[PDB]
Amino acid sequence: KIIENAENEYQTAISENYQTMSDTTFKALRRQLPVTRTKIDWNKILSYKIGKEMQNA
Amino acid sequence: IANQPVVIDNGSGVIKAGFAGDQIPKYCFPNYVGRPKHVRVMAGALEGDIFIGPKAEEHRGLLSIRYPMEHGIVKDWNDMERIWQYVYSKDQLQTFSEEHPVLLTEAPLNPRKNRERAAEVFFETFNVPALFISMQAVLSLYATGRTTGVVLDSGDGVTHAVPIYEGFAMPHSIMRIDIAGR
Ligand SMILES: Nc1ncnc2c1ncn2[C@@H]1O[C@H](COP(=O)(O)OP(=O)(O)O)[C@@H](O)[C@H]1O
């Protein structure tokens, strides 16, 4: 019974880690989107980078 | 290339006009056209069928007030164009529209057709050197001196809240309601 409980908790925790990694560690290394929840507009970045550096200073 | 760009805040209630570098808008007048309702019988009377700003404030009883723009949407462009013509008159600023560039501040989540028609007027009627349309929310933070922050702007025409991160407005979190000062 001690083996049963310990191995059940261990397998359960691995299953929880798969859901946890998707929401925390895996997303923490690379986000699906920036904090703005938008895709990067590459044409806007080329002109905006100059505008935002002076406007945010 | 030009001397100094003119900032024009197209507010629903009052139009705020001045030059970039000015601490306060030098010329602020109500955004409506007043036309005389009563008949002219005697000579040497008030000339003109159009009165805007302090001339309409002093003789308000004579005039019928019509607002060209409701909830930040221009219903009558003929009146709105005449008001922008008054911005460059001898009363306000008193400069050539072709000489100075213009910065206009529009409400968020407006139709594209408004910006397209607005642009046509200042490039065709006024032959402006350059035009830059700006959001109300982003400018409010630049003034306050914060790059990140939620702007709860409850205007005369519309009320809206824009969450802005590092000078960037989150287009999906913007919430605007028609209910305003009017
Ligand atoms: N002292 C005040 N108390 C309450 N409401 C006011 C006061 N002064 C002005 N207002 C309201 O605010 C409006 C002015 O908003 P406005 O400057 O046009 O904003 P925006 O240009 O950003 O739309 C007025 O028309 C009026 O309804």
Coordinates of N, CA and C and ligand atoms in Angstrom, one line a residue:
Chain A
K1 N 0.8 -1.2 0.0 CA 0.0 0.0 0.0 C 0.8 1.3 0.0
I2 N 2.0 1.3 0.7 CA 2.9 2.4 0.7 C 3.5 2.6 -0.7
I3 N 3.9 1.5 -1.4 CA 4.4 1.5 -2.8 C 3.3 2.1 -3.7
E4 N 2.1 1.5 -3.6 CA 0.9 2.0 -4.4 C 0.7 3.5 -4.3
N5 N 0.6 4.0 -3.1 CA 0.4 5.5 -2.9 C 1.5 6.3 -3.5
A6 N 2.8 5.9 -3.2 CA 4.0 6.7 -3.6 C 4.1 6.7 -5.1
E7 N 3.9 5.6 -5.8 CA 4.0 5.4 -7.3 C 2.8 6.1 -8.0
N8 N 1.6 6.1 -7.4 CA 0.5 6.8 -7.9 C 0.7 8.4 -7.8
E9 N 1.2 8.9 -6.7 CA 1.5 10.3 -6.6 C 2.6 10.7 -7.6
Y10 N 3.7 9.9 -7.7 CA 4.7 10.1 -8.7 C 4.2 10.2 -10.1
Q11 N 3.5 9.2 -10.6 CA 2.9 9.3 -11.9 C 1.9 10.4 -12.1
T12 N 1.1 10.7 -11.1 CA 0.2 11.9 -11.1 C 0.9 13.2 -11.2
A13 N 2.0 13.4 -10.5 CA 2.8 14.6 -10.5 C 3.5 14.8 -11.9
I14 N 3.9 13.7 -12.6 CA 4.4 13.8 -14.0 C 3.4 14.2 -14.9
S15 N 2.1 13.7 -14.8 CA 1.0 14.2 -15.6 C 0.7 15.7 -15.4
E16 N 0.8 16.1 -14.1 CA 0.6 17.5 -13.8 C 1.7 18.4 -14.4
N17 N 2.9 17.9 -14.4 CA 4.1 18.6 -14.9 C 3.9 18.9 -16.4
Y18 N 3.4 18.0 -17.2 CA 3.1 18.2 -18.6 C 2.2 19.4 -18.8
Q19 N 1.1 19.5 -18.1 CA 0.2 20.7 -18.1 C 0.9 21.9 -17.6
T20 N 1.7 21.8 -16.5 CA 2.4 22.9 -15.9 C 3.4 23.5 -16.9
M21 N 4.2 22.7 -17.5 CA 5.3 23.1 -18.5 C 4.7 23.9 -19.6
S22 N 3.6 23.5 -20.2 CA 2.9 24.2 -21.3 C 2.5 25.6 -20.9
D23 N 2.0 25.8 -19.6 CA 1.6 27.1 -19.1 C 2.7 28.0 -18.5
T24 N 3.7 27.4 -18.0 CA 4.8 28.1 -17.3 C 6.1 28.0 -18.0
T25 N 6.9 27.0 -17.7 CA 8.3 26.8 -18.2 C 8.4 26.9 -19.7
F26 N 7.6 26.2 -20.5 CA 7.7 26.2 -21.9 C 7.3 27.5 -22.6
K27 N 6.2 28.2 -22.1 CA 5.9 29.5 -22.5 C 6.8 30.6 -22.0
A28 N 7.4 30.4 -20.8 CA 8.4 31.3 -20.2 C 9.6 31.5 -21.0
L29 N 10.1 30.4 -21.6 CA 11.3 30.4 -22.5 C 11.0 31.2 -23.9
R30 N 9.8 30.9 -24.4 CA 9.3 31.6 -25.6 C 7.8 31.7 -25.5
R31 N 7.3 32.9 -25.5 CA 5.9 33.2 -25.5 C 5.3 32.9 -26.9
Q32 N 4.0 32.4 -26.9 CA 3.3 32.3 -28.2 C 3.0 33.6 -28.9
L33 N 2.7 34.7 -28.1 CA 2.6 36.1 -28.5 C 3.3 37.0 -27.4
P34 N 3.7 38.2 -27.9 CA 4.1 39.3 -26.9 C 3.0 39.6 -25.9
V35 N 3.4 40.3 -24.9 CA 2.4 40.7 -23.8 C 1.2 41.5 -24.3
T36 N 1.3 42.1 -25.5 CA 0.2 42.8 -26.2 C -0.8 41.8 -26.9
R37 N -0.5 40.5 -27.0 CA -1.3 39.5 -27.6 C -1.6 39.7 -29.1
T38 N -0.6 40.3 -29.8 CA -0.6 40.6 -31.2 C 0.7 40.0 -31.9
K39 N 0.6 39.7 -33.2 CA 1.8 39.3 -33.9 C 2.6 40.6 -34.2
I40 N 3.9 40.4 -34.3 CA 4.8 41.5 -34.6 C 4.6 42.0 -36.1
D41 N 4.4 43.3 -36.2 CA 4.2 44.0 -37.5 C 5.6 44.5 -37.9
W42 N 6.3 43.7 -38.8 CA 7.7 43.9 -39.1 C 7.9 45.3 -39.8
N43 N 6.9 45.8 -40.6 CA 7.0 47.1 -41.3 C 6.8 48.2 -40.3
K44 N 5.9 48.0 -39.3 CA 5.7 49.0 -38.2 C 7.0 49.1 -37.3
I45 N 7.6 47.9 -37.0 CA 8.8 47.9 -36.1 C 10.0 48.7 -36.7
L46 N 10.2 48.6 -38.0 CA 11.3 49.3 -38.7 C 11.2 50.8 -38.5
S47 N 10.0 51.4 -38.7 CA 9.7 52.8 -38.5 C 9.4 53.1 -37.0
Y48 N 8.7 52.2 -36.3 CA 8.3 52.5 -34.9 C 9.5 52.5 -33.9
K49 N 10.5 51.6 -34.1 CA 11.6 51.5 -33.2 C 12.2 52.9 -33.0
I50 N 12.4 53.7 -34.1 CA 12.9 55.1 -34.0 C 11.9 56.0 -33.2
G51 N 10.6 55.9 -33.5 CA 9.6 56.7 -32.9 C 9.4 56.4 -31.4
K52 N 9.5 55.1 -31.0 CA 9.3 54.7 -29.6 C 10.5 55.0 -28.7
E53 N 11.7 54.9 -29.2 CA 12.9 55.3 -28.5 C 12.9 56.7 -28.0
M54 N 12.5 57.7 -28.9 CA 12.3 59.1 -28.5 C 11.0 59.4 -27.8
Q55 N 9.9 58.7 -28.0 CA 8.6 58.9 -27.4 C 8.6 58.3 -25.9
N56 N 9.3 57.3 -25.7 CA 9.4 56.6 -24.4 C 10.6 57.1 -23.5
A57 N 11.3 58.2 -23.9 CA 12.5 58.7 -23.3 C 12.1 60.0 -22.5
Chain B
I1 N 10.1 70.1 -45.4 CA 10.8 71.0 -44.4 C 9.9 72.2 -44.1
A2 N 9.8 72.6 -42.8 CA 9.0 73.8 -42.4 C 9.5 74.4 -41.1
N3 N 8.9 75.5 -40.6 CA 9.3 76.3 -39.5 C 8.9 75.6 -38.2
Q4 N 7.6 75.3 -38.0 CA 7.0 74.8 -36.7 C 5.6 74.2 -37.0
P5 N 5.4 72.9 -36.7 CA 4.1 72.3 -36.9 C 3.0 72.7 -36.0
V6 N 1.8 72.9 -36.5 CA 0.6 73.3 -35.7 C -0.2 72.0 -35.2
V7 N -0.4 71.9 -33.9 CA -1.2 70.8 -33.3 C -2.6 71.3 -33.2
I8 N -3.5 70.4 -33.7 CA -5.0 70.7 -33.8 C -5.7 69.5 -33.2
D9 N -6.2 69.6 -31.9 CA -7.0 68.5 -31.2 C -8.5 68.6 -31.6
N10 N -8.9 67.7 -32.5 CA -10.3 67.7 -33.0 C -11.3 67.1 -31.9
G11 N -11.4 67.9 -30.8 CA -12.3 67.5 -29.7 C -13.8 67.8 -30.1
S12 N -14.7 66.9 -29.6 CA -16.1 67.0 -29.8 C -16.7 68.3 -29.2
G13 N -16.3 68.7 -28.0 CA -16.8 69.9 -27.3 C -16.1 71.1 -27.8
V14 N -14.8 71.2 -27.6 CA -14.0 72.5 -27.9 C -12.7 72.0 -28.7
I15 N -12.4 72.8 -29.8 CA -11.2 72.6 -30.6 C -10.0 73.4 -30.0
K16 N -8.9 72.7 -29.7 CA -7.7 73.2 -29.1 C -6.6 73.3 -30.1
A17 N -6.1 74.5 -30.4 CA -5.1 74.8 -31.5 C -3.9 75.6 -30.9
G18 N -2.7 75.2 -31.3 CA -1.5 75.8 -31.0 C -0.3 75.2 -31.7
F19 N 0.9 75.8 -31.4 CA 2.2 75.4 -32.1 C 3.0 74.4 -31.1
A20 N 3.7 73.5 -31.7 CA 4.5 72.5 -31.0 C 5.6 73.2 -30.2
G21 N 5.7 73.0 -28.9 CA 6.6 73.7 -28.0 C 5.8 74.6 -27.0
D22 N 4.6 75.0 -27.4 CA 3.7 75.8 -26.6 C 3.2 75.0 -25.4
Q23 N 3.2 75.6 -24.2 CA 2.9 75.0 -22.9 C 1.4 74.7 -22.8
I24 N 0.5 75.6 -23.4 CA -1.0 75.5 -23.4 C -1.4 75.8 -24.8
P25 N -2.6 75.3 -25.2 CA -3.2 75.7 -26.5 C -3.7 77.1 -26.4
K26 N -3.1 78.0 -27.3 CA -3.3 79.5 -27.3 C -4.8 79.8 -27.7
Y27 N -5.4 79.0 -28.6 CA -6.7 79.2 -29.2 C -7.6 78.0 -29.0
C28 N -8.6 78.1 -28.1 CA -9.6 77.1 -27.8 C -11.0 77.7 -28.0
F29 N -11.8 77.1 -28.9 CA -13.2 77.6 -29.2 C -14.1 76.4 -29.3
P30 N -15.4 76.5 -29.0 CA -16.4 75.5 -29.2 C -16.5 74.9 -30.6
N31 N -16.7 73.6 -30.7 CA -16.8 72.9 -32.0 C -18.2 72.8 -32.5
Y32 N -18.8 74.0 -32.8 CA -20.2 74.1 -33.5 C -20.2 75.3 -34.3
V33 N -21.1 75.3 -35.3 CA -21.4 76.5 -36.2 C -22.7 77.1 -35.8
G34 N -22.7 78.4 -35.7 CA -24.0 79.2 -35.3 C -24.4 80.1 -36.5
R35 N -25.6 79.9 -36.9 CA -26.2 80.7 -38.1 C -27.4 81.5 -37.5
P36 N -27.5 82.8 -38.0 CA -28.6 83.7 -37.5 C -30.0 83.2 -37.9
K37 N -30.9 83.1 -37.0 CA -32.3 82.6 -37.2 C -33.2 83.8 -37.6
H38 N -33.0 84.9 -37.0 CA -33.8 86.1 -37.2 C -33.4 86.8 -38.5
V39 N -34.4 87.6 -39.1 CA -34.2 88.3 -40.4 C -33.5 89.7 -40.2
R40 N -32.6 90.1 -41.1 CA -31.9 91.4 -41.1 C -32.7 92.4 -41.8
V41 N -33.1 93.5 -41.1 CA -34.0 94.6 -41.7 C -33.2 95.9 -41.8
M42 N -32.3 96.2 -40.8 CA -31.6 97.5 -40.8 C -30.2 97.3 -41.3
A43 N -29.7 98.3 -42.0 CA -28.3 98.4 -42.5 C -27.3 98.7 -41.4
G44 N -26.1 98.2 -41.6 CA -25.0 98.3 -40.6 C -25.2 97.3 -39.5
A45 N -25.8 96.2 -39.8 CA -26.1 95.0 -38.9 C -24.9 94.1 -38.9
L46 N -25.0 93.0 -38.1 CA -23.9 91.9 -38.1 C -23.8 91.2 -39.4
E47 N -22.7 91.4 -40.1 CA -22.5 90.8 -41.5 C -22.1 89.3 -41.4
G48 N -22.5 88.5 -42.3 CA -22.1 87.1 -42.4 C -23.3 86.2 -41.9
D49 N -23.5 85.0 -42.5 CA -24.5 84.0 -42.0 C -23.8 82.9 -41.2
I50 N -22.5 83.0 -41.0 CA -21.7 82.0 -40.2 C -21.0 82.8 -39.1
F51 N -21.1 82.3 -37.8 CA -20.4 82.8 -36.6 C -19.8 81.6 -35.9
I52 N -18.5 81.6 -35.6 CA -17.7 80.5 -34.9 C -16.9 81.1 -33.8
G53 N -16.9 80.5 -32.6 CA -16.0 80.8 -31.4 C -16.6 82.0 -30.7
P54 N -15.7 83.0 -30.3 CA -16.1 84.1 -29.4 C -17.2 85.0 -30.0
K55 N -17.3 85.1 -31.3 CA -18.3 85.9 -32.0 C -19.7 85.2 -31.8
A56 N -19.7 83.9 -31.8 CA -21.0 83.1 -31.5 C -21.3 83.0 -30.0
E57 N -20.3 83.1 -29.2 CA -20.5 83.2 -27.7 C -21.2 84.5 -27.3
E58 N -20.7 85.6 -27.8 CA -21.3 87.0 -27.5 C -22.7 87.2 -28.1
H59 N -23.0 86.7 -29.3 CA -24.3 86.9 -30.0 C -25.1 85.5 -30.1
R60 N -25.0 84.7 -29.0 CA -25.5 83.3 -29.0 C -27.0 83.3 -29.3
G61 N -27.8 84.2 -28.7 CA -29.3 84.3 -28.8 C -29.7 84.4 -30.2
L62 N -29.0 85.1 -31.0 CA -29.3 85.4 -32.5 C -29.2 84.0 -33.3
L63 N -28.2 83.2 -32.9 CA -27.7 82.1 -33.7 C -28.4 80.8 -33.4
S64 N -28.5 79.9 -34.4 CA -28.9 78.5 -34.2 C -27.7 77.6 -34.3
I65 N -27.4 76.8 -33.2 CA -26.2 76.0 -33.0 C -26.5 74.6 -33.6
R66 N -25.5 74.2 -34.5 CA -25.5 72.8 -35.0 C -24.1 72.3 -34.9
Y67 N -23.9 71.1 -34.2 CA -22.6 70.4 -34.0 C -22.4 69.5 -35.2
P68 N -21.3 69.7 -36.0 CA -21.1 68.9 -37.2 C -20.7 67.4 -36.9
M69 N -20.1 67.2 -35.7 CA -19.5 65.9 -35.3 C -20.2 65.4 -34.0
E70 N -20.7 64.1 -34.0 CA -21.4 63.5 -32.9 C -20.7 62.1 -32.6
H71 N -20.3 61.9 -31.3 CA -19.6 60.7 -30.8 C -18.3 60.5 -31.6
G72 N -17.6 61.6 -32.0 CA -16.4 61.6 -32.7 C -16.5 61.2 -34.2
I73 N -17.7 61.3 -34.8 CA -18.0 60.9 -36.2 C -18.6 62.2 -36.9
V74 N -18.0 62.6 -38.0 CA -18.3 63.9 -38.7 C -19.5 63.6 -39.6
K75 N -20.7 64.1 -39.3 CA -22.0 63.9 -40.1 C -22.0 64.9 -41.2
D76 N -21.6 66.1 -41.0 CA -21.6 67.2 -42.0 C -20.1 67.7 -42.1
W77 N -19.5 67.3 -43.3 CA -18.1 67.6 -43.7 C -18.0 69.1 -44.1
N78 N -19.0 69.7 -44.7 CA -19.0 71.1 -45.2 C -18.8 72.0 -44.0
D79 N -19.5 71.8 -42.9 CA -19.4 72.6 -41.7 C -18.0 72.3 -41.0
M80 N -17.5 71.1 -41.0 CA -16.3 70.6 -40.3 C -15.1 71.3 -41.1
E81 N -15.1 71.3 -42.4 CA -14.1 71.9 -43.3 C -14.0 73.4 -43.0
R82 N -15.2 74.1 -42.9 CA -15.3 75.6 -42.7 C -14.7 75.9 -41.3
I83 N -14.8 75.0 -40.3 CA -14.3 75.2 -39.0 C -12.7 75.1 -39.0
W84 N -12.2 74.2 -39.8 CA -10.7 74.0 -40.0 C -10.2 75.2 -40.8
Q85 N -11.0 75.8 -41.7 CA -10.7 77.1 -42.4 C -10.7 78.2 -41.4
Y86 N -11.5 78.2 -40.4 CA -11.5 79.2 -39.3 C -10.3 79.1 -38.4
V87 N -9.8 77.9 -38.3 CA -8.5 77.6 -37.5 C -7.4 78.5 -38.0
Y88 N -7.3 78.7 -39.3 CA -6.2 79.5 -40.0 C -6.7 80.9 -40.3
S89 N -7.8 81.4 -39.7 CA -8.3 82.7 -39.9 C -7.5 83.8 -39.1
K90 N -7.9 85.0 -39.2 CA -7.1 86.1 -38.5 C -7.4 86.1 -36.9
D91 N -8.5 85.4 -36.5 CA -8.8 85.3 -35.1 C -7.9 84.3 -34.4
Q92 N -7.8 83.1 -34.9 CA -7.0 82.0 -34.4 C -5.7 81.7 -35.2
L93 N -4.5 81.6 -34.6 CA -3.2 81.3 -35.2 C -2.8 82.4 -36.2
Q94 N -3.6 82.6 -37.3 CA -3.3 83.6 -38.4 C -2.0 83.2 -39.1
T95 N -2.0 82.1 -39.8 CA -0.9 81.6 -40.5 C -1.4 80.8 -41.8
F96 N -0.5 80.5 -42.7 CA -0.8 79.8 -44.0 C -0.8 78.3 -43.8
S97 N -1.8 77.6 -44.2 CA -2.0 76.1 -44.0 C -1.0 75.3 -44.8
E98 N -0.6 75.9 -45.9 CA 0.4 75.3 -46.8 C 1.9 75.4 -46.3
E99 N 2.1 76.3 -45.3 CA 3.4 76.7 -44.8 C 3.8 75.7 -43.6
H100 N 2.8 75.4 -42.7 CA 3.0 74.7 -41.5 C 2.4 73.3 -41.6
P101 N 3.1 72.2 -41.2 CA 2.5 70.8 -41.1 C 1.5 70.8 -39.9
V102 N 0.6 69.8 -40.0 CA -0.5 69.6 -39.0 C -0.4 68.2 -38.3
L103 N -0.7 68.2 -37.0 CA -0.9 67.0 -36.2 C -2.4 67.0 -35.7
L104 N -3.2 66.0 -36.1 CA -4.6 65.8 -35.7 C -4.7 64.6 -34.7
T105 N -5.5 64.7 -33.7 CA -5.7 63.7 -32.6 C -7.1 63.2 -32.7
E106 N -7.3 61.9 -33.3 CA -8.6 61.3 -33.5 C -8.9 60.3 -32.3
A107 N -10.2 60.0 -32.1 CA -10.7 59.0 -31.1 C -10.3 57.6 -31.6
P108 N -10.2 56.7 -30.6 CA -9.8 55.3 -31.0 C -11.0 54.5 -31.6
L109 N -10.8 53.5 -32.4 CA -11.8 52.6 -33.0 C -12.8 53.4 -33.9
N110 N -12.3 54.5 -34.6 CA -13.0 55.3 -35.6 C -13.0 54.5 -36.9
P111 N -14.0 54.7 -37.8 CA -13.9 54.2 -39.2 C -12.7 54.8 -40.0
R112 N -12.2 54.0 -40.9 CA -11.0 54.3 -41.8 C -11.5 55.4 -42.8
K113 N -12.7 55.4 -43.2 CA -13.3 56.4 -44.2 C -13.2 57.8 -43.7
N114 N -13.3 58.0 -42.3 CA -13.1 59.4 -41.7 C -11.7 59.9 -41.9
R115 N -10.7 59.1 -41.6 CA -9.3 59.4 -41.7 C -8.9 59.7 -43.2
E116 N -9.5 58.9 -44.1 CA -9.3 59.0 -45.6 C -9.9 60.4 -46.1
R117 N -11.1 60.7 -45.6 CA -11.7 62.0 -46.0 C -11.1 63.2 -45.3
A118 N -10.7 63.1 -44.1 CA -10.0 64.1 -43.2 C -8.7 64.4 -43.9
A119 N -7.9 63.4 -44.4 CA -6.6 63.6 -45.1 C -6.8 64.3 -46.4
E120 N -7.8 64.0 -47.2 CA -8.1 64.6 -48.5 C -8.3 66.1 -48.3
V121 N -9.0 66.6 -47.3 CA -9.3 68.0 -47.0 C -8.0 68.8 -46.8
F122 N -7.1 68.3 -45.9 CA -5.9 69.0 -45.5 C -4.8 69.0 -46.6
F123 N -4.8 68.0 -47.5 CA -3.9 67.9 -48.7 C -4.4 68.5 -49.9
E124 N -5.8 68.6 -50.1 CA -6.4 69.1 -51.4 C -6.8 70.6 -51.1
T125 N -7.7 70.9 -50.1 CA -8.2 72.2 -49.7 C -7.0 73.1 -49.2
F126 N -6.3 72.6 -48.2 CA -5.2 73.3 -47.4 C -3.8 73.1 -47.9
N127 N -3.5 72.2 -48.8 CA -2.1 71.8 -49.4 C -1.1 71.8 -48.3
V128 N -1.3 71.1 -47.2 CA -0.4 71.0 -46.0 C 0.9 70.3 -46.4
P129 N 2.1 70.7 -45.8 CA 3.3 70.0 -46.1 C 3.2 68.5 -45.7
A130 N 2.8 68.3 -44.4 CA 2.7 66.9 -43.9 C 1.6 66.8 -42.8
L131 N 0.9 65.7 -42.8 CA -0.2 65.4 -41.8 C 0.2 64.1 -41.0
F132 N 0.0 64.1 -39.7 CA 0.2 63.0 -38.8 C -1.0 62.9 -37.9
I133 N -1.8 61.8 -38.0 CA -3.0 61.4 -37.2 C -2.4 60.7 -36.0
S134 N -2.8 61.0 -34.8 CA -2.4 60.4 -33.5 C -3.6 60.0 -32.6
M135 N -3.4 58.9 -31.8 CA -4.5 58.5 -30.9 C -4.6 59.4 -29.7
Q136 N -5.7 59.5 -29.1 CA -6.0 60.4 -27.9 C -5.3 59.9 -26.7
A137 N -5.3 58.5 -26.5 CA -4.8 57.8 -25.3 C -3.3 57.9 -25.2
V138 N -2.6 57.6 -26.3 CA -1.1 57.5 -26.3 C -0.5 58.9 -25.9
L139 N -1.1 60.0 -26.5 CA -0.7 61.4 -26.3 C -0.9 61.8 -24.8
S140 N -2.0 61.4 -24.2 CA -2.4 61.7 -22.8 C -1.3 61.1 -21.8
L141 N -0.7 59.9 -22.1 CA 0.3 59.3 -21.4 C 1.7 60.1 -21.6
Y142 N 2.0 60.4 -22.8 CA 3.3 61.2 -23.2 C 3.3 62.5 -22.3
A143 N 2.2 63.2 -22.2 CA 2.0 64.4 -21.4 C 2.3 64.1 -19.9
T144 N 1.6 63.1 -19.4 CA 1.8 62.6 -18.0 C 3.2 62.1 -17.7
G145 N 3.9 61.6 -18.7 CA 5.3 61.1 -18.7 C 5.4 59.6 -18.3
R146 N 4.3 58.8 -18.6 CA 4.3 57.3 -18.3 C 4.2 56.6 -19.6
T147 N 5.1 55.6 -19.9 CA 5.1 54.8 -21.1 C 4.0 53.7 -21.1
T148 N 3.8 53.1 -19.9 CA 2.8 52.1 -19.6 C 1.7 52.7 -18.7
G149 N 0.4 52.4 -19.0 CA -0.7 52.8 -18.2 C -2.1 52.8 -18.9
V150 N -3.2 52.6 -18.2 CA -4.6 52.6 -18.7 C -5.1 54.0 -18.7
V151 N -5.5 54.6 -19.8 CA -6.1 55.9 -20.0 C -7.6 55.9 -20.1
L152 N -8.3 56.3 -19.0 CA -9.8 56.4 -18.9 C -10.2 57.8 -19.3
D153 N -10.4 58.0 -20.6 CA -10.7 59.3 -21.3 C -12.2 59.4 -21.5
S154 N -12.9 60.1 -20.6 CA -14.3 60.4 -20.7 C -14.6 61.8 -21.3
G155 N -14.7 61.8 -22.7 CA -14.8 63.1 -23.4 C -16.2 63.6 -23.5
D156 N -16.5 64.6 -24.3 CA -17.8 65.2 -24.6 C -18.6 64.3 -25.5
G157 N -17.9 63.7 -26.5 CA -18.5 62.8 -27.5 C -18.6 61.4 -27.1
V158 N -17.5 60.8 -26.7 CA -17.3 59.3 -26.4 C -16.4 59.2 -25.1
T159 N -16.7 58.1 -24.4 CA -15.8 57.6 -23.2 C -15.1 56.3 -23.6
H160 N -13.8 56.2 -23.5 CA -13.0 55.0 -23.8 C -11.9 54.8 -22.8
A161 N -11.5 53.6 -22.6 CA -10.3 53.2 -21.8 C -9.4 52.3 -22.6
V162 N -8.1 52.8 -22.8 CA -7.1 52.1 -23.6 C -5.9 51.7 -22.7
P163 N -5.7 50.4 -22.5 CA -4.5 49.9 -21.9 C -3.3 50.0 -22.8
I164 N -2.2 50.7 -22.5 CA -1.0 51.0 -23.3 C 0.2 50.5 -22.6
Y165 N 1.0 49.7 -23.3 CA 2.3 49.1 -22.8 C 3.5 49.6 -23.6
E166 N 4.4 50.3 -23.0 CA 5.6 50.9 -23.6 C 5.3 51.7 -24.8
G167 N 4.2 52.5 -24.7 CA 3.7 53.4 -25.7 C 2.9 52.7 -26.8
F168 N 2.6 51.4 -26.7 CA 1.8 50.5 -27.6 C 0.5 50.2 -27.0
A169 N -0.6 50.6 -27.7 CA -2.0 50.4 -27.3 C -2.5 49.0 -27.8
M170 N -3.0 48.2 -26.8 CA -3.5 46.8 -27.0 C -4.8 46.9 -27.7
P171 N -4.9 46.6 -29.0 CA -6.1 46.8 -29.8 C -7.3 46.0 -29.3
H172 N -7.0 44.9 -28.6 CA -8.0 44.0 -28.2 C -8.6 44.3 -26.8
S173 N -8.0 45.1 -26.0 CA -8.4 45.5 -24.7 C -9.1 46.8 -24.7
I174 N -9.2 47.5 -25.8 CA -9.8 48.9 -25.9 C -11.3 48.7 -25.7
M175 N -11.9 49.5 -24.8 CA -13.4 49.5 -24.5 C -13.9 51.0 -24.6
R176 N -14.8 51.2 -25.6 CA -15.4 52.5 -25.8 C -16.9 52.4 -25.7
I177 N -17.6 53.4 -25.1 CA -19.1 53.5 -25.0 C -19.5 54.9 -25.5
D178 N -20.7 55.0 -26.2 CA -21.2 56.2 -26.8 C -21.6 57.2 -25.7
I179 N -22.0 56.8 -24.5 CA -22.4 57.7 -23.4 C -21.2 58.6 -23.0
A180 N -21.4 59.9 -23.1 CA -20.4 61.0 -22.8 C -21.1 62.3 -22.2
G181 N -20.3 63.3 -22.0 CA -20.7 64.6 -21.4 C -22.0 65.1 -22.0
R182 N -22.2 65.0 -23.3 CA -23.4 65.6 -24.0 C -24.6 64.8 -23.5
Ligands
LIG1 N1 -16.1 71.6 -14.8 C1 -16.7 70.6 -15.5 N2 -17.4 69.7 -14.8 C2 -18.0 68.7 -15.5 N3 -18.0 68.4 -16.8 C3 -17.3 69.4 -17.4 C4 -16.6 70.4 -16.9 N4 -16.0 71.2 -17.9 C5 -16.3 70.6 -19.0 N5 -17.1 69.4 -18.8 C6 -17.5 68.5 -19.8 O1 -16.4 68.1 -20.6 C7 -16.6 68.5 -22.0 C8 -15.3 68.9 -22.6 O2 -14.7 67.7 -23.2 P1 -13.6 67.9 -24.3 O3 -12.5 68.9 -23.8 O4 -14.3 68.2 -25.6 O5 -12.9 66.5 -24.5 P2 -12.3 65.8 -25.8 O6 -11.9 66.9 -26.7 O7 -11.1 64.9 -25.4 O8 -13.4 64.9 -26.4 C9 -17.7 69.6 -22.0 O9 -18.4 69.7 -23.2 C10 -18.6 69.2 -20.8 O10 -19.5 68.3 -21.2

